[model samples]
Target: GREVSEDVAKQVARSFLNLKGNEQIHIVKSGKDADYEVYSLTITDPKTNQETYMDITQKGGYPLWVLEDRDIKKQNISLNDAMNKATKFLKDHRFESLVMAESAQYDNMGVFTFVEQTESGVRIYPDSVKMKMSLEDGSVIGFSAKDFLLKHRTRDIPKPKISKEQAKTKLNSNVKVMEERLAIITNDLNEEVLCYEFLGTIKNDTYRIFINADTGFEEKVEKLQN
Candidate 1:
């Protein structure tokens, strides 16, 4: 149980991925405990923002590549649909051995990516569980477990009090769109975003959206394909 260095991170990440050591490597904290700390070593390719990362623990010498990601592209799933799947997986009995740690979503206009930690009684043991999932661009869909399932670990679906924004608004003519409703909030706001969702279509395939809710901003207009 101890704190490792960037040198160690690079060494591990390189050997694990077979990349050159001179490649720019970034450091990130993954987790920690009284005995030691957990760290992630990341290598971000210059052209593609694809990040291949691995998490390492100092105390128990456990390590895992939480995300060995590829460039994002569109897939057959929506972000909300992906979230539903991820939520179901966590709440499913087959995987009743994981816990979610207030997740983060990379959804705005890009891949529907989400990560939730898997815990073993809070993962007092190392190499516990962590994942990277993408519902868009149809990239690698990932999952796992080990000392992870010593017991049953069921979970709950998230609940929101705010009703989703109904009624569509006109979109600018030059854009194609996909509409969905998800919870998000701006900086310093106590409430979740709770905005009507809109994203790029086969035309631009981007994350252009109308996020602000305190105004008469129109939700982008388009006939939804589905």
Candidate 2:
């Protein structure tokens, strides 16, 4: 879900610009030492008051696809122009619809990012993508896509990883499973840690379960909703 492809860049650009016709888009490697790519639109100047650019790269093995800018002219038109060009390329290539199923912006540096599930029909990953967006300008400042796609396929789950029966065995005798979700929450250091949080009910009380997002083992449980 990281690294916006040439095709995605174009799609994002076209949608944002509301262009009547298709335009050429390009994804160029960033000049910096990092292995980052920049999405740029071929159009010289856009007529709109908004602009967009996405940084698609992995920092420490995590996806950093972000909507670098939002409003134009607040800083510099040149920067905004560059973002517009890149966003055009993303829209033309269907990057937003392709890589992101849903997105939202919160504070200046927090972004909510999500990706769609692979269409292979295999239960290889999770179903929803959720990320926080940076409010600084609508750029994706931080994100995670490990649940839908694993970084390394060879990494094996523990042989005795908690089974459905084992998980049930740990529950209270009257507790009933209601809902569950899986995620890989990482820290500022970018370390991968898996979790499985569950919701349940027991008599008049409701509870939530927190487990190792990766290993499927129960970590903690809380009772709420009376």
Candidate 3:
């Protein structure tokens, strides 16, 4: 694997922002890993006197993450608006075809978790990216694509051995299914498993259940905080 120069890394990080000639970029080596020669950027915008931090990989100059130093005073945009802004930001940054898998709101900030989807409609949970949007201005204030960059691949997604109906039989009788889909998720053993992901409700509580497609075994069950 080849590595890029520090100047190139700075250029890669700056391409994400519309600089007004008042921004200075400082780069430093980060992340002690051979997979990537990571460059951390501290960009100072003198116009607003705000500092923005970012990271870029050296080999192909992939933007890894970004964070802004600012305070959001009020919420002017709804969560839906923030989601749109986040999607655009990732698209503009030239990321893969990612879809939001989870979202949450914290005051004026909207945090969205995105995962890559295969052509066959299987979601790749290992390749995940996260973005933080400012509700006040509908701007993306934070982003992280560490997992996406490291785990991204053209995976040969496996077909489910069991049907969706068979997978549902593994769930509790009280659980009412709302949605079902195929997904590739990482298990506790750090192995990938093709699963039938079921979004269902147990009375008033919504839950996410994953059943192993090959064995029809319950792999995981998580409660969604609604």
Candidate 4:
């Protein structure tokens, strides 16, 4: 139904995230994304009035994971511990297609990010999820699959013609390959191209280079400022 009530959406989020027994939550609003419908939810603590926000898919009642929604403070736990907790949370919810592809620490936050694994390799058209773990008390502060969950679609992921070594030859001489993978770069599904994804570094700068799997040409280059 288009008019999914706030109460129903809240119930869905609570069960999805496994809210505590004493915690109370409700749907605050409803909206639609470019591809699907969703309802915004908020969890409020009766004791301290602390609030947390989450969203749910309108059609199937699946939870829409959000990152940066939970701003946390002061972490006492280690990054490894927090990352482990976040991984546990994902496995607990049956995210088996997602594999640990990247991780980074920002201040006190540890983000254990994942890329969707397919028969071909991995989807790299922003089809990624990140578990933002708060180093404070080893809490999983946030789960972010907004791009992956919203934009990911069923498609035929073909094999790459160029090998990792071939892709390396196309890279700049200063760049050293840190890691490599086969990835899907979705462009309206049909125009989607399977590419050799290379994560490389040049002295102090990092880049994500996607080379065409079929044509042996560079598809895209994303530079991450170090």
Candidate 5:
């Protein structure tokens, strides 16, 4: 995968964009990240001359990033419509078994986050893909998959030493967990660890707390964004 040629990279970009036969493409730049090589390219719609800039990886030809800056005159689509478009986009790009984990709307656009899940339903937080869609027409306008490319891999997940109820004892009294599940997450030490992810509420605010499954240690905590 390291010897990917420019012609091949261009082909990858074209396929990702689903370019029409008349669309124009140009390679603007090329570089390498520690994890993957990147080819920055631009695709233009000849009729409107609108350009879409993208960075595609050389190894797996993954879309490391993509963006199309355009003014939207109206938000005529609903969040559900935007999500369907994003899901279809990922499916068209051969990304499989990715479940929608989070979503939000802002500035007339919808942002959706998806993560890979194991056969047993454990979420892989480190291998997530985020997409942005324009609410005007439910078209995807941005995408990022760096975390997925950098951390996605098969792992030998160990069985929990402690039970789920036992892990509950580790939470604070005020934090009432509404949902719980197993998840693979990157800890502060930059190491991926198995943990029990608890989605809870304290007063009117919500939080996600991760407790190490093997040792029952509190690994991390974050207040959910509004």
Candidate 6:
């Protein structure tokens, strides 16, 4: 049994070291010798603080992507435009996944796969996950898994946190408004509520504003522009 664990650790270390462009890989053990072996890899960037140290006999290889910095450059486009294009792309590609997280800045906004991309298709990652890319260069800029797979019971008749008339007051009248729609935040719980979501632009900047339809209160506002 001990021999098998050591063999597995060696295999993992070899594979990690063989990966192209990786800087370093090392193997060490934590606690008792009976405990599983641990492997760590350290890349150059301090920002990445990138380290993968785990019991090889248990976790196996962790898929990590070293994205090129060139990919994150800003682009000239509104957040709404980027989202529309991204949604259309995903739909046309027939991608079956949900938007886990998103960031809508004036110059960059795009979604990423929170789930690992698999041969069968994409599915949500088992652990906390999120991915967002820049609109300018189509580079991934944001990723996180701070709230992965946490189930929330739906509220059937949850009241709006804000009122509609008050929500309307927050809008800039000059912005050309587009369509509004309802979105389900979570389906695990029976909570089905309406949202007064609007899409529009001001001074060439597009935005998606969400208001609680029942209460008419503005819930969130996303500004999109380049």
* lDDT for each candidate structure: 0.45, 0.43, 0.85, 0.71, 0.84, 0.46
CA deviation > 4 Å runs, candidate 1? 1-3, 30-36, 71-226
Question: What does the lDDT come to for candidate 6?
Answer: 0.46
> What are the models' TM-scores?
0.31, 0.41, 0.89, 0.76, 0.83, 0.41
Error of 6 at 201 (Å): 1.2
How far in Å is the alpha carbon of 7 misplaced in model 6? 9.1
- Candidate with best TM-score: 3
Please give the RMSD to the true structure for each candidate, in Å. Answer: 12.5, 10.4, 2.3, 4.0, 2.9, 9.6
Off by over 4 Å in 3: 1-3, 30-35
- Name the Cα RMSD for model 5: 2.9
Candidate 5, residue 178: lDDT: 97
Candidate 5 TM-score, true structure as reference: 0.83
- Model 3, residue 90: distance off in Å is 1.6
| TM-score between model 2 and native | 0.41
Please report the TM-score between candidate 3 and the true structure.
0.89
C-alpha lDDT of residue 30 in model 5? 53
On lDDT, who's better, 2 or 3? 3
**Residues 1-226 of candidate 4: C-alpha lDDT, one tens digit per residue:** 3555666777766665667768866564544335557776667777877777777777666667653345567878776677677777777876667776666778788877787787655765567887777787666667777767777778766666767778778877887888988887754445668888888887778888888877778777877643
Evaluate residue 223 in candidate 3 and report its C-alpha lDDT on the 0 to 100 scale.
86
Residue 68, candidate 6: Cα error in Å is 8.3
Give per-candidate clash totals. 10, 44, 0, 1, 0, 17
Residue 58 lDDT (model 1): 45
